[model samples]
Target: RPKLSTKDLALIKADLAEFEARELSSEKILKDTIKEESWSDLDFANDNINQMIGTMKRYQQEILSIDAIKRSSEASADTEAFKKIFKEWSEFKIERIQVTIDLLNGKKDSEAVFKKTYPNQIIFDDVRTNKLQTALNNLKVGYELL
Candidate 1:
Protein backbone atom coordinates (compact mmCIF):
# COMPACT_ATOMS: atom_id res chain seq x y z
CA ARG A 1 0.00 0.00 0.00
CA PRO A 2 1.07 3.56 -0.59
CA LYS A 3 2.24 5.54 2.42
CA LEU A 4 -0.05 8.31 3.62
CA SER A 5 0.72 11.51 5.42
CA THR A 6 -0.58 11.72 8.94
CA LYS A 7 -2.47 14.79 7.95
CA ASP A 8 -4.06 12.85 5.14
CA LEU A 9 -4.55 9.76 7.22
CA ALA A 10 -5.92 11.55 10.27
CA LEU A 11 -9.07 12.54 8.50
CA ILE A 12 -9.85 8.87 7.94
CA LYS A 13 -9.53 7.88 11.59
CA ALA A 14 -11.96 10.40 12.90
CA ASP A 15 -15.55 9.29 13.49
CA LEU A 16 -14.74 5.80 12.21
CA ALA A 17 -15.75 4.05 15.38
CA GLU A 18 -19.18 5.56 15.12
CA PHE A 19 -19.37 4.83 11.45
CA GLU A 20 -18.34 1.23 11.85
CA ALA A 21 -20.67 0.82 14.75
CA ARG A 22 -23.52 2.25 12.73
CA GLU A 23 -22.74 -0.06 9.85
CA LEU A 24 -22.35 -3.19 11.93
CA SER A 25 -25.43 -2.49 13.96
CA SER A 26 -27.45 -2.20 10.81
CA GLU A 27 -25.96 -5.41 9.50
CA LYS A 28 -26.85 -7.26 12.67
CA ILE A 29 -30.35 -5.89 12.67
CA LEU A 30 -30.91 -6.71 9.03
CA LYS A 31 -29.17 -10.07 8.73
CA ASP A 32 -32.23 -12.27 8.92
CA THR A 33 -34.48 -10.04 6.87
CA ILE A 34 -31.85 -9.67 4.18
CA LYS A 35 -31.37 -13.40 3.99
CA GLU A 36 -35.04 -14.27 3.84
CA GLU A 37 -35.87 -12.03 0.89
CA SER A 38 -39.06 -11.22 2.69
CA TRP A 39 -41.20 -8.15 3.18
CA SER A 40 -38.95 -7.62 6.14
CA ASP A 41 -36.29 -6.44 3.70
CA LEU A 42 -38.25 -3.24 3.38
CA ASP A 43 -38.35 -3.05 7.13
CA PHE A 44 -34.62 -3.50 7.19
CA ALA A 45 -34.16 -0.58 4.85
CA ASN A 46 -36.46 1.55 6.94
CA ASP A 47 -34.49 0.64 10.03
CA ASN A 48 -31.24 1.65 8.35
CA ILE A 49 -32.62 4.98 7.19
CA ASN A 50 -33.38 5.86 10.77
CA GLN A 51 -29.85 5.01 11.90
CA MET A 52 -28.13 7.11 9.23
CA ILE A 53 -30.14 10.15 10.18
CA GLY A 54 -28.97 9.80 13.76
CA THR A 55 -25.40 9.34 12.58
CA MET A 56 -25.45 12.64 10.72
CA LYS A 57 -25.51 14.47 14.03
CA ARG A 58 -22.55 12.41 15.23
CA TYR A 59 -20.77 12.96 11.95
CA GLN A 60 -20.86 16.68 12.63
CA GLN A 61 -19.43 16.13 16.08
CA GLU A 62 -16.75 13.85 14.59
CA ILE A 63 -15.76 16.41 12.00
CA LEU A 64 -15.19 18.95 14.74
CA SER A 65 -13.18 16.46 16.78
CA ILE A 66 -10.98 15.61 13.80
CA ASP A 67 -10.33 19.29 13.16
CA ALA A 68 -9.36 19.75 16.79
CA ILE A 69 -6.74 17.02 16.52
CA LYS A 70 -5.54 17.60 12.97
CA ARG A 71 -2.47 19.74 13.58
CA SER A 72 -1.47 18.16 16.87
CA SER A 73 -0.53 14.83 15.29
CA GLU A 74 1.41 14.96 12.05
CA ALA A 75 4.77 13.24 11.73
CA SER A 76 5.61 9.76 13.07
CA ALA A 77 2.02 8.62 13.34
CA ASP A 78 1.48 5.25 11.68
CA THR A 79 -1.52 5.17 9.37
CA GLU A 80 -2.17 1.71 7.94
CA ALA A 81 -5.66 1.42 9.38
CA PHE A 82 -6.10 5.11 8.81
CA LYS A 83 -5.55 4.60 5.11
CA LYS A 84 -7.96 1.66 4.92
CA ILE A 85 -10.59 3.45 6.94
CA PHE A 86 -10.25 6.71 5.05
CA LYS A 87 -10.24 5.15 1.63
CA GLU A 88 -13.39 3.25 2.55
CA TRP A 89 -15.00 6.37 4.01
CA SER A 90 -14.14 8.48 0.98
CA GLU A 91 -15.93 6.00 -1.27
CA PHE A 92 -19.05 6.24 0.84
CA LYS A 93 -18.58 9.96 1.38
CA ILE A 94 -18.57 10.62 -2.33
CA GLU A 95 -22.02 9.11 -2.65
CA ARG A 96 -23.18 10.93 0.47
CA ILE A 97 -21.77 14.21 -0.79
CA GLN A 98 -23.59 13.80 -4.06
CA VAL A 99 -26.86 13.12 -2.31
CA THR A 100 -26.33 16.20 -0.18
CA ILE A 101 -25.63 18.26 -3.26
CA ASP A 102 -28.77 16.91 -4.81
CA LEU A 103 -30.75 17.96 -1.79
CA LEU A 104 -29.21 21.41 -1.88
CA ASN A 105 -29.95 21.66 -5.59
CA GLY A 106 -33.62 20.95 -4.99
CA LYS A 107 -33.55 17.61 -6.71
CA LYS A 108 -34.83 15.83 -3.62
CA ASP A 109 -37.00 16.29 -0.62
CA SER A 110 -35.76 16.94 2.90
CA GLU A 111 -38.99 15.37 4.00
CA ALA A 112 -39.69 12.00 5.50
CA VAL A 113 -39.65 9.16 3.00
CA PHE A 114 -41.40 6.69 5.27
CA LYS A 115 -45.01 7.49 5.95
CA LYS A 116 -46.19 4.34 7.66
CA THR A 117 -42.82 3.59 9.15
CA TYR A 118 -41.77 7.05 10.34
CA PRO A 119 -44.44 9.50 9.14
CA ASN A 120 -42.40 12.66 9.81
CA GLN A 121 -39.08 14.25 9.05
CA ILE A 122 -38.15 14.34 12.71
CA ILE A 123 -38.40 10.58 13.09
CA PHE A 124 -36.94 9.94 9.68
CA ASP A 125 -34.09 12.30 10.29
CA ASP A 126 -33.45 11.12 13.80
CA VAL A 127 -33.64 7.41 13.04
CA ARG A 128 -33.29 6.51 9.40
CA THR A 129 -29.95 7.71 8.04
CA ASN A 130 -27.74 5.65 10.32
CA LYS A 131 -29.79 2.53 9.74
CA LEU A 132 -29.60 3.00 6.03
CA GLN A 133 -25.83 3.45 6.10
CA THR A 134 -25.45 0.24 8.04
CA ALA A 135 -27.76 -1.75 5.80
CA LEU A 136 -25.90 -0.45 2.79
CA ASN A 137 -22.48 -1.49 4.06
CA ASN A 138 -23.88 -4.82 5.15
CA LEU A 139 -25.29 -5.41 1.71
CA LYS A 140 -21.90 -4.62 0.26
CA VAL A 141 -19.95 -6.99 2.50
CA GLY A 142 -22.59 -9.67 2.22
CA TYR A 143 -22.35 -9.67 -1.53
CA GLU A 144 -18.56 -9.72 -1.33
CA LEU A 145 -18.74 -12.80 0.84
CA LEU A 146 -20.91 -14.63 -1.67
Candidate 2:
Protein backbone atom coordinates (compact mmCIF):
# COMPACT_ATOMS: atom_id res chain seq x y z
CA ARG A 1 0.00 0.00 0.00
CA PRO A 2 1.09 3.57 -0.53
CA LYS A 3 2.37 5.63 2.36
CA LEU A 4 -0.37 7.54 4.13
CA SER A 5 -0.14 10.61 6.30
CA THR A 6 -1.06 10.09 9.94
CA LYS A 7 -4.46 11.69 9.42
CA ASP A 8 -5.13 9.61 6.31
CA LEU A 9 -3.83 6.44 7.91
CA ALA A 10 -5.87 7.05 11.02
CA LEU A 11 -8.98 7.38 8.90
CA ILE A 12 -8.21 4.27 6.90
CA LYS A 13 -7.38 2.24 9.98
CA ALA A 14 -10.55 3.37 11.70
CA ASP A 15 -12.62 2.40 8.68
CA LEU A 16 -11.01 -1.02 8.22
CA ALA A 17 -10.97 -1.85 11.91
CA GLU A 18 -14.61 -0.87 12.25
CA PHE A 19 -15.44 -3.15 9.36
CA GLU A 20 -13.61 -6.20 10.73
CA ALA A 21 -14.79 -5.75 14.31
CA ARG A 22 -18.42 -5.37 13.27
CA GLU A 23 -18.23 -8.44 11.04
CA LEU A 24 -16.94 -10.57 13.89
CA SER A 25 -19.36 -9.11 16.43
CA SER A 26 -22.51 -9.51 14.34
CA GLU A 27 -21.58 -13.00 13.13
CA LYS A 28 -20.90 -14.17 16.63
CA ILE A 29 -24.13 -12.75 18.01
CA LEU A 30 -26.14 -14.03 15.04
CA LYS A 31 -24.76 -17.52 15.37
CA ASP A 32 -25.39 -17.45 19.09
CA THR A 33 -28.93 -16.12 18.51
CA ILE A 34 -28.81 -13.65 21.32
CA LYS A 35 -29.61 -9.93 21.46
CA GLU A 36 -28.26 -8.88 24.85
CA GLU A 37 -26.07 -10.99 27.03
CA SER A 38 -27.99 -12.94 29.61
CA TRP A 39 -26.57 -14.34 32.84
CA SER A 40 -25.14 -17.66 31.77
CA ASP A 41 -22.04 -19.74 31.32
CA LEU A 42 -21.36 -17.85 28.11
CA ASP A 43 -21.00 -14.58 29.97
CA PHE A 44 -17.32 -14.57 29.17
CA ALA A 45 -18.03 -14.65 25.45
CA ASN A 46 -20.60 -11.95 25.94
CA ASP A 47 -18.06 -9.77 27.68
CA ASN A 48 -15.70 -10.11 24.76
CA ILE A 49 -18.53 -9.32 22.38
CA ASN A 50 -19.29 -6.20 24.37
CA GLN A 51 -15.71 -5.01 24.04
CA MET A 52 -15.61 -5.71 20.32
CA ILE A 53 -18.82 -3.77 19.81
CA GLY A 54 -17.40 -0.82 21.71
CA THR A 55 -14.27 -0.80 19.58
CA MET A 56 -16.29 -1.01 16.40
CA LYS A 57 -18.54 1.84 17.53
CA ARG A 58 -15.53 4.00 18.34
CA TYR A 59 -14.09 3.47 14.90
CA GLN A 60 -17.41 4.25 13.27
CA GLN A 61 -17.63 7.49 15.25
CA GLU A 62 -14.15 8.54 14.28
CA ILE A 63 -14.86 7.81 10.63
CA LEU A 64 -17.90 10.02 10.86
CA SER A 65 -15.89 12.74 12.57
CA ILE A 66 -13.29 12.79 9.85
CA ASP A 67 -16.14 13.10 7.41
CA ALA A 68 -17.25 16.21 9.27
CA ILE A 69 -13.82 17.69 8.76
CA LYS A 70 -14.13 17.13 5.05
CA ARG A 71 -17.47 18.84 4.96
CA SER A 72 -16.14 21.88 6.76
CA SER A 73 -13.84 22.42 3.82
CA GLU A 74 -16.69 24.12 1.97
CA ALA A 75 -16.22 27.30 3.94
CA SER A 76 -13.93 28.55 1.20
CA ALA A 77 -13.36 27.67 -2.43
CA ASP A 78 -10.45 29.83 -3.62
CA THR A 79 -9.71 30.97 -0.07
CA GLU A 80 -9.72 27.56 1.60
CA ALA A 81 -13.51 27.54 1.24
CA PHE A 82 -13.44 24.38 -0.83
CA LYS A 83 -11.29 22.63 1.73
CA LYS A 84 -13.51 23.94 4.49
CA ILE A 85 -16.65 22.79 2.76
CA PHE A 86 -15.14 19.41 2.06
CA LYS A 87 -14.28 19.07 5.70
CA GLU A 88 -17.75 20.14 6.82
CA TRP A 89 -19.44 17.96 4.23
CA SER A 90 -17.44 14.95 5.26
CA GLU A 91 -18.12 15.48 8.93
CA PHE A 92 -21.80 16.12 8.36
CA LYS A 93 -21.99 12.69 6.79
CA ILE A 94 -24.32 10.72 9.01
CA GLU A 95 -23.55 7.46 10.77
CA ARG A 96 -27.01 6.15 10.21
CA ILE A 97 -26.16 2.49 9.62
CA GLN A 98 -29.79 1.68 8.94
CA VAL A 99 -29.81 4.23 6.14
CA THR A 100 -26.80 2.58 4.62
CA ILE A 101 -28.24 -0.90 5.15
CA ASP A 102 -31.42 0.13 3.44
CA LEU A 103 -29.41 1.16 0.41
CA LEU A 104 -27.43 -2.05 0.51
CA ASN A 105 -30.50 -4.29 0.88
CA GLY A 106 -32.20 -2.32 -1.91
CA LYS A 107 -34.85 -0.89 0.38
CA LYS A 108 -33.85 2.69 -0.56
CA ASP A 109 -32.73 3.14 -4.14
CA SER A 110 -33.18 6.88 -4.31
CA GLU A 111 -29.52 7.82 -4.38
CA ALA A 112 -27.49 7.11 -7.48
CA VAL A 113 -24.41 6.66 -5.39
CA PHE A 114 -26.01 3.81 -3.46
CA LYS A 115 -26.98 2.17 -6.73
CA LYS A 116 -23.56 2.76 -8.16
CA THR A 117 -21.66 1.65 -5.10
CA TYR A 118 -23.91 -1.30 -4.36
CA PRO A 119 -22.25 -2.00 -1.04
CA ASN A 120 -20.13 -5.14 -1.29
CA GLN A 121 -18.92 -7.42 1.47
CA ILE A 122 -16.36 -4.95 2.70
CA ILE A 123 -18.79 -2.06 2.85
CA PHE A 124 -21.53 -4.19 4.38
CA ASP A 125 -19.19 -5.71 6.90
CA ASP A 126 -17.57 -2.46 7.91
CA VAL A 127 -20.05 0.35 7.16
CA ARG A 128 -23.48 -1.18 6.82
CA THR A 129 -24.97 -4.24 8.56
CA ASN A 130 -22.27 -4.80 11.11
CA LYS A 131 -22.33 -1.21 12.34
CA LEU A 132 -26.13 -1.17 12.44
CA GLN A 133 -26.32 -4.39 14.42
CA THR A 134 -23.60 -3.26 16.78
CA ALA A 135 -25.33 0.03 17.48
CA LEU A 136 -28.65 -1.73 17.93
CA ASN A 137 -27.18 -4.24 20.37
CA ASN A 138 -25.18 -1.61 22.24
CA LEU A 139 -28.21 0.41 23.19
CA LYS A 140 -27.12 0.27 26.82
CA VAL A 141 -23.61 -0.27 28.13
CA GLY A 142 -24.78 -2.90 30.60
CA TYR A 143 -26.77 -4.68 27.93
CA GLU A 144 -25.29 -7.86 26.46
CA LEU A 145 -25.66 -9.15 22.97
CA LEU A 146 -28.47 -11.64 23.39
Candidate 3:
Protein backbone atom coordinates (compact mmCIF):
# COMPACT_ATOMS: atom_id res chain seq x y z
CA ARG A 1 0.00 0.00 0.00
CA PRO A 2 1.04 3.59 -0.59
CA LYS A 3 2.21 5.61 2.37
CA LEU A 4 0.65 8.81 3.74
CA SER A 5 2.59 12.08 3.52
CA THR A 6 3.85 13.66 6.72
CA LYS A 7 1.67 16.70 6.14
CA ASP A 8 -1.41 14.54 5.80
CA LEU A 9 -0.54 12.66 8.95
CA ALA A 10 0.02 15.78 10.99
CA LEU A 11 -3.19 17.35 9.74
CA ILE A 12 -5.07 14.23 10.71
CA LYS A 13 -3.38 14.07 14.10
CA ALA A 14 -4.32 17.67 14.84
CA ASP A 15 -8.00 17.10 14.19
CA LEU A 16 -8.49 13.36 14.66
CA ALA A 17 -9.43 13.36 18.31
CA GLU A 18 -12.17 15.94 17.93
CA PHE A 19 -13.47 14.44 14.72
CA GLU A 20 -13.64 10.95 16.23
CA ALA A 21 -15.50 12.24 19.26
CA ARG A 22 -18.12 13.97 17.10
CA GLU A 23 -18.47 10.94 14.82
CA LEU A 24 -18.91 8.58 17.76
CA SER A 25 -21.47 10.92 19.33
CA SER A 26 -23.46 10.98 16.09
CA GLU A 27 -23.23 7.19 15.79
CA LYS A 28 -24.53 6.80 19.32
CA ILE A 29 -27.56 8.95 18.55
CA LEU A 30 -28.36 6.88 15.48
CA LYS A 31 -27.91 3.62 17.38
CA ASP A 32 -30.09 4.82 20.24
CA THR A 33 -32.88 5.76 17.84
CA ILE A 34 -32.60 2.38 16.15
CA LYS A 35 -32.85 0.58 19.47
CA GLU A 36 -35.70 2.65 20.93
CA GLU A 37 -38.28 1.89 18.24
CA SER A 38 -40.33 -1.33 18.45
CA TRP A 39 -39.47 -3.90 15.78
CA SER A 40 -43.11 -4.73 14.87
CA ASP A 41 -44.38 -1.13 14.85
CA LEU A 42 -41.34 0.11 12.96
CA ASP A 43 -40.89 -3.00 10.85
CA PHE A 44 -41.35 -1.20 7.53
CA ALA A 45 -40.20 2.31 8.53
CA ASN A 46 -37.33 0.92 10.56
CA ASP A 47 -36.00 -0.92 7.53
CA ASN A 48 -35.51 2.37 5.72
CA ILE A 49 -34.10 4.05 8.81
CA ASN A 50 -31.66 1.18 9.34
CA GLN A 51 -30.40 1.54 5.79
CA MET A 52 -29.74 5.25 6.33
CA ILE A 53 -28.02 4.59 9.63
CA GLY A 54 -25.91 1.84 8.10
CA THR A 55 -24.71 4.10 5.30
CA MET A 56 -23.83 6.82 7.77
CA LYS A 57 -21.96 4.31 9.94
CA ARG A 58 -20.10 3.01 6.92
CA TYR A 59 -18.87 6.46 6.00
CA GLN A 60 -17.84 7.08 9.57
CA GLN A 61 -15.93 3.80 9.63
CA GLU A 62 -14.26 4.64 6.32
CA ILE A 63 -13.06 7.96 7.67
CA LEU A 64 -11.79 6.36 10.85
CA SER A 65 -10.04 3.67 8.85
CA ILE A 66 -8.32 6.26 6.69
CA ASP A 67 -7.20 8.13 9.77
CA ALA A 68 -5.82 4.93 11.24
CA ILE A 69 -3.88 4.26 8.05
CA LYS A 70 -2.52 7.78 8.06
CA ARG A 71 -1.36 7.39 11.64
CA SER A 72 0.34 4.14 10.79
CA SER A 73 1.99 5.72 7.76
CA GLU A 74 3.43 8.55 9.86
CA ALA A 75 6.01 6.14 11.32
CA SER A 76 7.60 5.91 7.84
CA ALA A 77 7.26 9.54 6.71
CA ASP A 78 10.20 11.95 6.68
CA THR A 79 10.25 15.18 8.69
CA GLU A 80 10.07 17.78 5.91
CA ALA A 81 6.38 17.39 5.15
CA PHE A 82 5.52 17.71 8.83
CA LYS A 83 7.58 20.93 9.02
CA LYS A 84 5.89 22.29 5.93
CA ILE A 85 2.38 21.64 7.24
CA PHE A 86 3.26 23.17 10.61
CA LYS A 87 4.65 26.28 8.95
CA GLU A 88 1.66 26.63 6.65
CA TRP A 89 -0.88 26.33 9.47
CA SER A 90 1.06 28.75 11.67
CA GLU A 91 1.54 31.27 8.86
CA PHE A 92 -2.16 31.22 8.04
CA LYS A 93 -3.07 31.83 11.68
CA ILE A 94 -0.50 34.63 11.99
CA GLU A 95 -1.76 36.31 8.85
CA ARG A 96 -5.35 36.03 10.01
CA ILE A 97 -4.57 37.57 13.40
CA GLN A 98 -2.56 40.37 11.83
CA VAL A 99 -5.41 41.21 9.48
CA THR A 100 -7.86 41.17 12.40
CA ILE A 101 -5.67 43.58 14.34
CA ASP A 102 -5.52 45.84 11.30
CA LEU A 103 -9.31 45.75 11.06
CA LEU A 104 -9.92 46.71 14.69
CA ASN A 105 -7.45 49.61 14.62
CA GLY A 106 -10.32 51.76 13.37
CA LYS A 107 -8.36 52.72 10.29
CA LYS A 108 -10.27 52.17 7.08
CA ASP A 109 -6.84 52.25 5.47
CA SER A 110 -6.55 48.52 6.21
CA GLU A 111 -6.72 48.14 2.46
CA ALA A 112 -3.37 49.92 2.14
CA VAL A 113 -1.76 48.15 5.15
CA PHE A 114 -2.84 44.79 3.83
CA LYS A 115 -1.39 45.60 0.40
CA LYS A 116 2.03 46.38 1.87
CA THR A 117 1.98 43.31 4.17
CA TYR A 118 0.85 40.50 1.89
CA PRO A 119 0.69 39.58 -1.79
CA ASN A 120 -3.03 38.93 -1.32
CA GLN A 121 -5.18 42.00 -0.81
CA ILE A 122 -8.52 40.21 -1.26
CA ILE A 123 -8.18 38.64 2.18
CA PHE A 124 -8.56 42.10 3.60
CA ASP A 125 -11.32 43.13 1.22
CA ASP A 126 -13.32 39.97 1.73
CA VAL A 127 -13.01 39.63 5.52
CA ARG A 128 -12.54 43.14 6.85
CA THR A 129 -13.40 45.97 4.45
CA ASN A 130 -17.17 45.95 4.05
CA LYS A 131 -17.94 45.12 7.67
CA LEU A 132 -15.32 47.58 8.82
CA GLN A 133 -16.94 50.21 6.66
CA THR A 134 -20.31 49.46 8.15
CA ALA A 135 -18.97 49.50 11.69
CA LEU A 136 -17.25 52.84 11.06
CA ASN A 137 -20.41 54.24 9.54
CA ASN A 138 -22.93 52.80 11.99
CA LEU A 139 -21.25 52.49 15.35
CA LYS A 140 -19.70 54.86 17.90
CA VAL A 141 -17.05 52.22 18.78
CA GLY A 142 -15.59 52.64 15.30
CA TYR A 143 -15.04 56.40 15.57
CA GLU A 144 -14.10 56.78 19.23
CA LEU A 145 -10.97 54.66 18.93
CA LEU A 146 -9.55 56.50 15.95
Candidate 4:
Protein backbone atom coordinates (compact mmCIF):
# COMPACT_ATOMS: atom_id res chain seq x y z
CA ARG A 1 0.00 0.00 0.00
CA PRO A 2 2.95 2.34 -0.46
CA LYS A 3 2.37 5.41 -2.58
CA LEU A 4 4.27 5.85 -5.83
CA SER A 5 5.47 9.08 -7.31
CA THR A 6 4.42 10.15 -10.79
CA LYS A 7 7.80 9.21 -12.14
CA ASP A 8 7.59 5.78 -10.59
CA LEU A 9 4.12 5.21 -12.01
CA ALA A 10 5.28 6.29 -15.45
CA LEU A 11 8.23 3.94 -15.27
CA ILE A 12 5.99 1.07 -14.25
CA LYS A 13 3.65 1.78 -17.14
CA ALA A 14 6.52 1.93 -19.62
CA ASP A 15 7.94 -1.34 -18.34
CA LEU A 16 4.53 -2.97 -18.56
CA ALA A 17 4.27 -1.86 -22.16
CA GLU A 18 7.74 -3.23 -22.88
CA PHE A 19 6.90 -6.56 -21.27
CA GLU A 20 3.69 -6.80 -23.29
CA ALA A 21 5.57 -6.13 -26.52
CA ARG A 22 8.14 -8.80 -25.73
CA GLU A 23 5.39 -11.29 -24.91
CA LEU A 24 3.65 -10.55 -28.17
CA SER A 25 6.83 -10.99 -30.19
CA SER A 26 7.68 -14.23 -28.42
CA GLU A 27 4.19 -15.58 -29.00
CA LYS A 28 4.44 -14.77 -32.70
CA ILE A 29 7.79 -16.54 -33.06
CA LEU A 30 6.57 -19.54 -31.10
CA LYS A 31 3.49 -19.84 -33.27
CA ASP A 32 5.48 -19.43 -36.49
CA THR A 33 8.00 -22.07 -35.45
CA ILE A 34 5.30 -24.52 -34.44
CA LYS A 35 3.35 -23.83 -37.62
CA GLU A 36 6.27 -24.93 -39.79
CA GLU A 37 6.87 -28.27 -38.03
CA SER A 38 4.99 -31.56 -38.04
CA TRP A 39 3.30 -32.53 -34.78
CA SER A 40 4.93 -35.95 -34.71
CA ASP A 41 8.41 -34.84 -35.76
CA LEU A 42 11.31 -34.44 -33.34
CA ASP A 43 11.97 -30.96 -34.70
CA PHE A 44 8.55 -29.78 -33.55
CA ALA A 45 9.21 -30.78 -29.98
CA ASN A 46 12.66 -29.18 -30.04
CA ASP A 47 11.25 -25.97 -31.50
CA ASN A 48 8.48 -25.91 -28.89
CA ILE A 49 10.96 -26.44 -26.09
CA ASN A 50 13.22 -23.69 -27.38
CA GLN A 51 10.30 -21.28 -27.60
CA MET A 52 9.23 -22.13 -24.07
CA ILE A 53 12.74 -21.40 -22.85
CA GLY A 54 12.68 -18.10 -24.71
CA THR A 55 9.37 -17.20 -23.07
CA MET A 56 10.75 -18.00 -19.64
CA LYS A 57 13.81 -15.89 -20.28
CA ARG A 58 11.66 -12.95 -21.28
CA TYR A 59 9.56 -13.38 -18.15
CA GLN A 60 12.67 -13.50 -15.97
CA GLN A 61 14.11 -10.36 -17.54
CA GLU A 62 10.86 -8.40 -17.21
CA ILE A 63 10.54 -9.36 -13.56
CA LEU A 64 14.07 -8.23 -12.86
CA SER A 65 13.38 -4.90 -14.59
CA ILE A 66 10.27 -4.42 -12.47
CA ASP A 67 12.26 -5.10 -9.31
CA ALA A 68 14.90 -2.62 -10.42
CA ILE A 69 12.33 0.13 -10.85
CA LYS A 70 10.68 -0.74 -7.55
CA ARG A 71 14.01 -0.17 -5.86
CA SER A 72 14.76 3.03 -7.76
CA SER A 73 12.57 5.43 -5.78
CA GLU A 74 14.15 4.37 -2.51
CA ALA A 75 17.62 4.74 -4.02
CA SER A 76 17.05 8.28 -5.28
CA ALA A 77 16.76 9.83 -1.83
CA ASP A 78 20.33 9.01 -0.81
CA THR A 79 22.51 11.08 -3.10
CA GLU A 80 25.70 10.76 -1.06
CA ALA A 81 25.37 6.99 -0.78
CA PHE A 82 24.73 6.77 -4.50
CA LYS A 83 27.81 8.87 -5.29
CA LYS A 84 30.08 6.76 -3.10
CA ILE A 85 28.87 3.55 -4.64
CA PHE A 86 29.16 5.00 -8.14
CA LYS A 87 32.77 6.00 -7.48
CA GLU A 88 33.61 2.48 -6.39
CA TRP A 89 31.75 1.13 -9.43
CA SER A 90 33.73 3.37 -11.79
CA GLU A 91 37.04 2.26 -10.31
CA PHE A 92 36.04 -1.37 -10.53
CA LYS A 93 35.05 -0.99 -14.19
CA ILE A 94 38.34 0.68 -15.11
CA GLU A 95 40.32 -2.13 -13.51
CA ARG A 96 38.16 -4.74 -15.24
CA ILE A 97 38.75 -3.14 -18.63
CA GLN A 98 42.49 -3.08 -18.00
CA VAL A 99 42.46 -6.71 -16.96
CA THR A 100 40.40 -7.67 -20.01
CA ILE A 101 42.88 -5.87 -22.27
CA ASP A 102 45.74 -7.74 -20.68
CA LEU A 103 43.78 -10.97 -20.94
CA LEU A 104 43.30 -10.38 -24.66
CA ASN A 105 47.00 -9.60 -25.11
CA GLY A 106 47.98 -13.02 -23.70
CA LYS A 107 48.93 -11.96 -20.19
CA LYS A 108 48.55 -15.03 -17.96
CA ASP A 109 48.38 -13.00 -14.74
CA SER A 110 45.27 -11.22 -15.98
CA GLU A 111 43.43 -14.51 -15.99
CA ALA A 112 44.19 -14.97 -12.33
CA VAL A 113 42.84 -11.50 -11.55
CA PHE A 114 39.72 -12.19 -13.57
CA LYS A 115 39.09 -15.44 -11.75
CA LYS A 116 40.02 -14.27 -8.26
CA THR A 117 38.59 -10.75 -8.17
CA TYR A 118 35.45 -11.17 -10.31
CA PRO A 119 34.57 -14.78 -10.97
CA ASN A 120 31.95 -15.21 -13.66
CA GLN A 121 30.89 -18.78 -14.32
CA ILE A 122 29.10 -17.71 -17.47
CA ILE A 123 30.88 -16.53 -20.59
CA PHE A 124 29.22 -13.19 -21.22
CA ASP A 125 30.53 -10.45 -23.50
CA ASP A 126 33.72 -8.50 -22.72
CA VAL A 127 31.80 -5.30 -22.06
CA ARG A 128 29.51 -7.01 -19.54
CA THR A 129 32.46 -8.46 -17.68
CA ASN A 130 32.10 -10.19 -14.34
CA LYS A 131 33.93 -7.44 -12.49
CA LEU A 132 31.57 -4.78 -13.80
CA GLN A 133 28.54 -6.88 -12.98
CA THR A 134 29.79 -7.55 -9.45
CA ALA A 135 30.41 -3.86 -8.95
CA LEU A 136 26.87 -2.98 -10.00
CA ASN A 137 25.39 -5.64 -7.75
CA ASN A 138 27.54 -4.43 -4.89
CA LEU A 139 26.31 -0.90 -5.49
CA LYS A 140 22.70 -2.09 -5.44
CA VAL A 141 23.23 -3.94 -2.18
CA GLY A 142 24.93 -0.95 -0.63
CA TYR A 143 22.07 1.31 -1.60
CA GLU A 144 19.31 -1.07 -0.55
CA LEU A 145 20.72 -2.52 2.67
CA LEU A 146 23.16 0.01 4.06
Please list the C-alpha lDDT of all candidates, in the order they appear. Answer: 0.42, 0.41, 0.41, 0.43
Best first by TM-score, ranked: 2, 1, 4, 3
- The weakest ten consecutive residues by lDDT in model 4 span 137-146
Off by over 4 Å in 4: 37-146
RMSD of each: 13.3, 13.5, 20.8, 13.6
Model 2 residue 89 lDDT score: 26
TM-score of 4: 0.29
Tell me the lDDT of model 2 at 49. 50
Select the stronger candidate by TM-score from 2 and 3.
Answer: 2
Cα displacement (Å) at residue 81, model 3: 2.1
Q: Please write out the lDDT profile of model 2 over residues 88-119, one tens digit for every residue.
A: 32222322232333333354643555435444
C-alpha TM-score for every candidate: 0.33, 0.35, 0.25, 0.29
lDDT of candidate model 3 versus the reference? 0.41
List clash counts for every candidate, in order. Answer: 17, 43, 0, 0
Model 2 Cα displacement at 80 (Å)?
Answer: 17
Count of clashing pairs, candidate 4: 0
Off by over 4 Å in 1: 1-14, 37-41, 53-61, 68-90, 93-146
Best by lDDT: 4
User: Over the stretch 36-79, how does candidate 3's per-residue lDDT look in tens digits?
Assistant: 64442334434543444454444333434454343544533433
